[PDB]
């Protein structure tokens, strides 16, 4: 009797269906918008339209990976989820943290608040309800919607002490609530160490997804991470030509499948800029691709390069059915934390 | 029987002595540091040495104007206060807000949390204790030290809707607790309108300082603001040549005193960059001026252009003793808010 | 028996009334918007409201100084004019050019097209109708509305060769049509030389206004320019604190009046950024000053520093009535251009 | 009996010879130069020397792809063409448009002037003569030289509404005059959609080249575009290491040849920065590669990876003889435009 | 029998005539040019013509204040000097250093080489001949031309430890050789301390000029510096409207003269950007002001505001004849350095 926690309540995992495991609709301000205006995405109407295209093509579930302090909007996302619920659409929202670059290293709550206290706060979003004020300040107003996954983030070619902190937070929260974990890696760097640290803390590899490996297109590395740790690689990459062509990802996915690793791969669009969805594009007077592109162009390319229907079905349906399912709750035991992790925490002044 | 609220406790106002009404020692990250590395000031020893030169010269009290989310550091500022208390040094800390530039207009708590609830949070800093975590997230740990003034801020040539919200917060908190108010203006613009709105909300002009008028060196405007509203103008500007020479502030002050407005003037250094203090300067391998310059150079210049010792004594001692003294508490009545302010809030979508 | 040429037709100069000699409402794209998004001003309703406030205070005429290739929008500006005509509002539009910084120095029509052909195009806007496509390409579609002044612009501390060319275009078009001229100077530099070159070309000093001298607050210079050339100084500057305080402009205007030069001064707000008007400011969620500030704040300051009622009446009414009045048409004789101007044109490679 | 339209007149296509399908010599100002001084290219002598090296290696024709408003220089390009005509050199110039980013979205003639009128202006450059003033304003002075191709451009990962407008201008101009079309794509994105839209408007796929696919090195995509639409891919990329190594392009071209697609490929250097030509390089005191590199290095690399001498002959000679040849003139019939295109124009607010 | 040291030899001070005490003609690369292309000044012919206008107006001597590492060009400046010597023109060149901003703080020779060794190098330039390679590396090739003054520089609102070192270098060189000193202040800040420090090292106030006080227009400050130290203030400022109007400097000079301080003022244009000279301006296709403006515009303004002809003769002729005259050689005794200076060197880590 396994379940996934959607903003509208817990569902049996058999109801996940085809799942986009890392995406966006609303990004309401926050540090990312600070980097470029294209990250501001505030249109419920355009988001609903895009979600309906995804559903038209066969999809059901979208995991919106915005942590409370970086863009997340509970109220507007709830509007979307309610608009598509009668159509079979599901939304899972996230608690937790993004990479350190997005938090003030001197005075942010990630930096200053004891880990145990931050855990209580992320547990509360998984089990009681998400803060409608997104943990922006001292006033909290909890939604009835709960988060169903927790996030952490690592930076370019380095795991910052605060990132190791957030990973500990992810692991403990997952340990305590049973919830899945997904981690943003920057250009697909430090993926192996992210998995190792999470597992070293006590997290279940079965519940771990690592995003953005597409930006480090090293098929050997992909296979190493999977075989050494048992985690799952959530790829984005389709229609991101300023990074890498679609063909590059299709062939690296084929390799992993040929090596028997098809149960450890999920897909996403990570459409987290305004021009990365079709309907959002229209609001900007532009023709752009969005969620339908996955079905209209990328999956056919997977088939063309020789990935089987069966492996595609694992990627879209069975793998997410597994990695997003809640585990049973457990106690967190500090004495089970690996020595490698403890020694790193000491080196990084985290205790 | 009036008192001022210092971080070490309430003191009779006769103990304030010569008072620097707007300054800094610790700025611990935050949005300002984002603009320039020089805003990052993290040295308690350097701070204490500088406070001791200020005291050596005759000073006693420094009001550190850092609102919780912009640079404020309760723990480190307490270290500084404790180091000089036995020299008769006093530190007053601030609650409230800075100008809107420093808050995410979409998702910050200033933008999203109801005024009433923000007021509760600022009142608690004045009456229970400041959050050691500086209100930068949902976990709060209150210090024994309380804030003794509340801040608001306005931007260049404009009062943003969120700054009008912070001004209502400042007025409400002040009304409820009796605490003084100090408002940052940007280049000394909108000073008149800040005064008017605060009074319109029901705040006491006797408790209101407006900072930075020295950056809009308009003697007629100074006089207008003081005569029309009865607030106090807190000038910084000594050793700020990239803006205006010391002589200009000296002459403008001479004019106000000659007009009979000496009770409406306070002074400060606003040394909110690392090269604005002597001891901090030495930590970056430079000779720089700081708090002692007020006495060694600027007051002699005041005397030189013809400001009397009595007027100087009001500026440094009697004025602060008045405007920093807590008022008798009142209840806030929203129906007594002025029609001009009600109309503005409607126009800015605040109600 | 003189007329001014408004976008709704020529009017007796007695109908000009209180005139704002340099301002803006619509800035639709162009080189300025490239410098900052605040230069984009596209709101007809907000413009009309601001215009009505100006009329409410006693104003009648506004001269929108937008050359065709820099922001001008004939269609939207006509909407504003028609909205206020029944209130006695007048709008005068501009042909000609901005400072060289706004024109490609290699390939723009300013750089490349022979002066005589450019003159014909500017004459045509004065005498047949403004291009609704604003001279931004090879297709022209003329409005029934004609321009009633021509602009040129000079840059910081320099008159560029293309700017001398635009000065020649201005002088020739004014000579041929009788139209007035207004020149933008950058920070009030080169104003004397602008005056001299135009007169050198054959332009009537009586038709020439030079803007932005307020940004070079040198009373002796103001006096020199007026006494040596007889042109008119159009000041902006109220509520522009980042440059200079209102008080400085007032006192410099008092100086000029005291020297007998009150017939050579006009006033303007030059509200050419979106936060420089009250109603535009509301569209961005801010309280700001705009056109009414001239009457509510700056004119009373002029009185307060001692400028006579007659001088204010000249500045606001009689001087605009003189400088905006069309001259009798003349022919331009090139062999009559001053020797100073001829030599400079050789030096700058303009033949 | 087919001709190509060179700046020196129409020539039998058999006289095209080896053809560089996308290159540059003169870039006189314009928006690109605004991006980087390196785009400014003004040296006729250096350009003629480079052209002579190209001829010395066996080249004959160079298509210079500068649309009127972005860099184009009729006078100087004619100087180049006249200097090499007796050496067998041919120059073809372009009318039409660059990508939207290079035009003011509010006030540029692309934005504001009705499509039909723009078409007339582009047909005129093809059939009467190019404007020596490059359509940079309201004065036109036609050269005897005519353009022999029309350009459009699309931006990164999107076709802007104005770009769809320029594509319609390109299709209509080609249908009306018979001229060929070349489209800049940004990083090789949206190539398939560009092809379908042009075709949708009624353009002859046989007349269509699309540039920059080399920047999206996806052999499957290249193949899809060619097979589904019949257009021709004009690659640049030799000696552009900051994007991709020569080897990648060579291997992708080999792939296309192996799949039977060798008739759908042309080559170019797109030497549109000053350090992308040997002789221009010399003027800046640098050793750099230029046009000769095509023959000295890249074509030998194509042989090395196994591209047949026939495929290479097709790429350099036969394919350009087909794609650059004028079609018989036709009438444009709006009712023939595809439903997909019509629906998109509605979605983009283009009627 | 005093002499000044020009690049063509020692001259009797009576041959100085009207002397521009801080200016430029050639700025050949260096750290300044890295800040803005406008600092690049390479035109000997334009420089000569400008010098000739200066001479035509009555001027004789120009002190070019470029220290060896920042822009200085011995070869080209000699060309200029040689072209005007027969017109009675003199060029004095400089040794020493600019402000610390222009030297690598970690590894520049100023940072790393012991003070004593640097003094030897600067002494060599005054006494044997300037390095034609400008001390920009290990290979030295001395000109027959000697430097006739030594420079030092201080930064904004601070004297950097490396600037104190350079001040020590300046004092020691001056004490050893008798040469005069000129110090650039940044925005006219720290002028008092520069004076005190040089004096505390043992330099003669009679030989000291401090530049750029015009950027800190505080008349009381000017008087304090002169009255307390006896140094000379070298003003630039004419036609630098982006800082301050000419009228401000004229009035502040009038003040100093009225206080009996006319012997302590020199003048200069500091035309150290390419548009700050008339002839250089012409090479850029612009009309600009330069050296002649001193005589045509600024000196008449001085008279206008009431500065006497005798005060003006001092500023131009008598004062430079005093401050630029060599002192008799003396010995440097480090034991005689003021306690204030010793104390600061310890605080700044300079031992
Ligand atoms: Zn991510
Ligand atoms: Zn994402
Ligand atoms: Zn402030
Ligand atoms: Zn401050
Ligand atoms: Zn202007
Ligand atoms: Zn303007
Ligand atoms: Zn291109
Ligand atoms: Zn190109
Ligand atoms: Zn300098
Ligand atoms: Zn200089």
UniProtKB/Swiss-Prot annotation, chains A, B, C, D, E:
A Pfam family reported for this protein in Swiss-Prot or TrEMBL: PTE
Reported function: Catalyzes the hydrolysis of D-xylono-1,4-lactone-5-phosphate and L-arabino-1,4-lactone-5-phosphate. Also able to hydrolyze carboxy 1,4-lactones.
Catalytic reaction annotation: a 1,4-lactone + H2O = a 4-hydroxyacid + H(+); D-xylono-1,4-lactone 5-phosphate + H2O = 5-phospho-D-xylonate + H(+); L-arabino-1,4-lactone 5-phosphate + H2O = 5-phospho-L-arabinonate + H(+)
Cofactor: Zn(2+)
Name of the protein this chain belongs to: Phospho-furanose lactonase
Binding site for substrate: 242-243, 273-276
InterPro entries: Metal_Hydrolase, PhFuoseLconase, Phosphotriesterase
Coiled coil region boundaries: none
Residue spans crossing the bilayer: none
